[PDB]
Symmetry: C4
Subunit: 404 residues, 4 copies
């Protein structure tokens, strides 16, 4: 995309400006050798004036009140080539400090980088990364200020920049070795305000990290606290340790399969067409694999499909017993069950991976002809008899059909 590469170029240009403008403010001799870049950057600095208005016009233009509002005002203020003229005129420090207006583009750059990276990047991590980048740029600018308040000396420019950056990293990280310290009162005022800013931004870093790690394992923490709540309630209820262990291993299966998410709660997040499609292709060819739903309209299939209730049967659990009066049918999704007798010694069948059981109770109220026992965790779907008749009432033709 041309918009993405243009935004990357604008970000690189603004990073170059943030690095250079204080650096050339304290080193005016650096202004001339990098003059061919600046004008190009300055061209970009005005080339982004319409293009941004163009790039927001393609994405739901609506209203674009430029030259006003909290948005696009710092962009236009930084867009004007103040830096070139002030560095050409070689104005004194109180007036040449206005060259930092060029750095006001950084807030718009951060907003644009948020907009182009709010999808594949966590907003907490994106905010932390933007804060860290702004902190590095601010550390460079603060080191440049420390240059500008250092006494003049014949120290090499690299060595004194290293010392200034070392001081501002000691200050900003709240470490403060104190080997290099303020000497003049103006340096002391500057160190006070830089200390306040560094404490503020280090608290910002710590808070952003705390926010990032507070929901780093939100699903696992939610599932574990649900398990703890259930276990505490059962221990209060004097539940036998065998059933507690069965519930614990069920929750372990739930966590290891679907991250402990309840299927019903996840499905209500979807709208009706998306829920319909999800539940149709969850039971894709599975629901129309049974005979009673054959030769039926796809509308009646979907009326079954939205009314299927998921239910997890742990290993060794009776789904339906023989002689039970029975009021439901079950469609195995990914588990496995065994159909046995009422005595559960002779295994009639083994059903897994999309087959079903209990359809006799769907067309008569006679008790179950056989017992169904869960071999392992089943993840099968239960359709109630009463819901089946409730949806059968408004399809009369298949209501007449299912007598056969």
């Amino acid at each position: 995309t041309y918009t993405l590469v243009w935004k990357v170029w604008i970000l690189a240009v603004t990073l170059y400006y943030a690095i250079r403008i204080p650096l050339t403010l304290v080193f005016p001799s650096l202004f001339s050798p990098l003059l061919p870049l600046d004008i190009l950057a300055s061209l970009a600095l005005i080339a982004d004036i319409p293009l941004d208005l163009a790039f927001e016009s393609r994405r739901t233009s609506g209203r674009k009140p430029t030259l006003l509002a909290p948005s696009r005002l710092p962009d236009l203020l930084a867009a004007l080539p103040l830096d070139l003229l002030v560095f050409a005129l070689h104005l004194p420090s109180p007036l040449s400090l206005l060259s930092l207006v060029r750095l006001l583009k950084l807030i718009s750059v951060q907003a644009s980088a948020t907009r182009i990276l709010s999808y594949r990047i966590n907003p907490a991590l994106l905010r932390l990364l933007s804060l860290v980048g702004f902190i590095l740029l601010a550390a460079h600018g603060i080191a440049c200020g420390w240059m500008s308040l250092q006494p003049p000396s014949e120290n090499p420019a690299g060595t004194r920049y290293l010392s200034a950056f070392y001081w501002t990293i000691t200050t900003l990280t709240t470490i403060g070795y104190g080997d290099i310290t303020p000497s003049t009162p103006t340096q002391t005022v500057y160190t006070i305000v830089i200390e306040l800013l560094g404490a503020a931004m280090y608290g910002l870093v710590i808070g952003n990290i705390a926010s990032l790690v507070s929901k780093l394992d939100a699903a696992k923490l939610l599932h574990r606290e649900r398990v703890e709540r259930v276990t505490a309630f059962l221990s209060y209820k004097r539940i036998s340790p065998e059933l507690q262990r069965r519930i614990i291993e069920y929750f372990d299966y739930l966590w290891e399969t679907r991250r402990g998410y309840e299927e019903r709660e996840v499905l209500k997040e979807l709208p009706h067409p998306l829920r319909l499609a999800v539940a149709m292709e969850i039971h894709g060819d599975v629901i129309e694999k049974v005979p009673l739903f054959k030769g039926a309209g796809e509308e009646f299939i979907r009326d079954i499909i939205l009314h299927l209730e998921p239910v997890i049967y742990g290993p060794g659990e009776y789904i339906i017993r023989a002689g039970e009066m029975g009021s439901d049918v079950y469609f195995i999704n990914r588990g496995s069950v065994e159909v046995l007798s009422a005595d559960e010694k002779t295994r009639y069948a083994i059903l897994s991976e999309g087959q079903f059981f209990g359809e006799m109770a769907l067309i008569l109220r006679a008790p179950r002809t056989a017992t169904v026992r869960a071999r392992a965790f089943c993840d099968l779907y239960r359709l109630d008899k009463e819901t089946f008749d409730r949806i059968l009432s408004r399809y009369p033709e298949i209501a007449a059909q299912i007598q056969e």
Copy 2:
């Protein structure tokens, strides 16, 4: 408002007192030149005694137990002109330390500033701002204490105040360069307690910042974790990547339109009259634009209106197909649909921006005469047939009407 400007004046007076009272405690020669201000401030310091009781009387007076309770007791304690008399008498330091009772008005000032700014300002940000202001005032007071425990010298007052403020900012920000350090045991005790206080208040700043940034993007984080939960569940269910992409782009549309908020959940927050008005002017002239709801009572219109179910149909999704038995009507809110044949090759019509489809199924149970396909995201509202008859039962006159 007179109350707001009076509270601003009281806040300014208390800030002046917080700046000056320790400053004139360590500089008694400052007491005389600022005497005309103090009495005026002292007048304000008693002028706020009834007016606050007046200003809380206008806002649900109820009970106003002054001269007692945790509220209004520090206000009255700071209201008395202790500072003027103690600075006039020039009492020694252990007894003149009681002039800080004037600064006890700061808690009431913070409470009042909270009350007048709990609407347009986030409570976390308001608490952080109050904490930062109190930290600056405490830093000034601690620097004044550092003056009061420094050995006497002919150093200029400004320079030594700068040194003291520099020390207390090193201490409070937990930086601690150590260039200036305790020398006397009393200074060491003072530095210990100031270090504990500064660590406490810096932890307060970091905690407030962490709280502020933990819910800085609460809507985006909630929507993203909902999307992650749905995507993880679908990937467990072996959902095809085409449907996963469709659900992802649906959630992107939901986030970019209504911040990922489910319409039903938002509407249950409103009470019945406000929900009625919201759903009436959401479908403003839209619901009475259809023929079957014409010449009807506005009560029956509102009975439709509260029972409309929102539903989002993604682009290329079938709302209703031709030959489907059909049990609902749809009112397009802001999307666009196309009415096509059962073969979906001949386009019958294009419907968008407030028009509707599917009204035949509202007065007969015959199948749909045409297929409706979503051009883009629809945001339309679905009214069920069964709900329509449920509300039609108790309006017999329009029940007789709608046969035509």
Copy 3:
């Protein structure tokens, strides 16, 4: 209570031990003058062995497995008078370091102080207070260790204790001036481990403060984010600014009255008898103030009472209009309404503070005889006609009564 004062005495004794045992470990000459206290404390140190087992026996004794388990094991280990014998024998430092076993009672003291103060004190604030007290005791112990690793000198004991406490407060608060620093390798190892411990406990303080302030305004933050969600949804729905302002002021009223809590959600937290009593005395003599519910059984009154639905009508809102078919009755709780004509020019009546309207629709289906308009926020309760007949079905005698 004897238990509370005994626990306070035990806490004071353990604080005395935590202050003294390292202090007398580095100052053996302090052991003899405070000998009469120690034995008394030692007596308390064994007097708490049965009494705690007694004090937990009064509060649901159940099982009390002493001399084992993570509970009551540190209590018994600290209970034995190791300190007295080791300070009597004057054993060398590696063996006399075992006198700190007496300080193991601090975890049991913290647990007991939690149990006796988990009701009127926030658990986050209680945890933070316990952490701060333990940090102060640990700072004293660490300063004593710093004494024990300082080179011997004729410095006064108070001055060197002040220096040691100053060092451990610099270390624990992560300030670190560096004016006093390790000199010997053993001091350097000690400073490394103390730095790790101080960073750990300062992170603990910051985390506890962050937890405390994350839910310091949980109700206000929840209400404000609900308001923001509703407002964002309505702005997406192009809701008119008049209705948005009405909803905003409704939410302001809700926050200023019931802290933004929905009445239904609060009532479901209560069990059936408590909900019954709450809703009975909310409408105390209010529900039996109307004529149709006179001479009725209190059981039928309570069947009305649990089925009353609260609803807030904002000022200037129509509750019921004249000519509306009407299916409910309303009991004003604390608001005020005006009964006017269909034209709403002639005011029939003003109803407030426990009276009612709309009872004709409770015994006939004829339309409303007059319009009811909300003067201000009403907080009235709505009883539906269908619910009224649903509960009237199983009281036949008053079903026969209400025809009159």
Copy 4:
């Protein structure tokens, strides 16, 4: 388990490598004496190449794309014996820095330790422990780097290692005494990057601690905020202080018994078979202790069992009064009730620990023959008459039975 002990051995080997590789990088003379260990470790470093692929094959093998993907790539990169060859060749520092590739196994070790300890250990605490271990290893490596940038001297290796570790603990904990400080520009660059890393990881520690303590008392905080919400709502409703105290003590009982968890909300977390088993053995032999449910099928017992509604009756509360028409039966779970007359002076009976009352209303609509008053908190279960007939409709045989 062989897998667990092999993972422990791998963790120990990688900890040995993390301790030694920088230590022998700055002390080449240490490479030869520990050569027999390294090769053994190197053997383990390749012995984990198939075994991990084996150990993930036993646990739902599925796909194992080794030699690629973000997983198993650092494991294989660290698996190759780069360290042995580079320390044998004695290559210079820029090329011998590649021996740290062996330390890339630490991320896989952390992941494996997470997987083997995500069950009995809190994920927040596990993350914090892994972070602290990685911080200690990084502190050792950073101290080794500080050695490598220190000027050469005849200082003892232990003493200078102690000084380097002291410096990196001052830096990483953001304490920064400044007694030992950078001297050379390369040391200053190293200190800058180490300061940034130490601030980052100390913010990580503080954030992890904040996350750990934000949900350290999640149940207690949730219950307390629910109690505060209910109390604030009732105080708004002018609820009498007697009923407020009764609700407060009910919530205290709820917290002290089931941690304030609502029974219904906990039960919906369970699936249908687990909920069936839980509610069956909660009423184990309790539900079939009553006469009307005798000689009945176990299916009808379970149909009762899933439809039992828990309800807490506080002490002195009327469950059912004599003369009340009555529409439910109650099964006492662990509380105690007294059956008295309508005048409640003559005590008919005392029922507790699994017995029941109110069964007459289960087979007739005549009013209650006696009043039932709660002696203490009851925790009994309520079965409605309407639900009883609703489940009785589809068992005709016991529907005929219960007339007797």
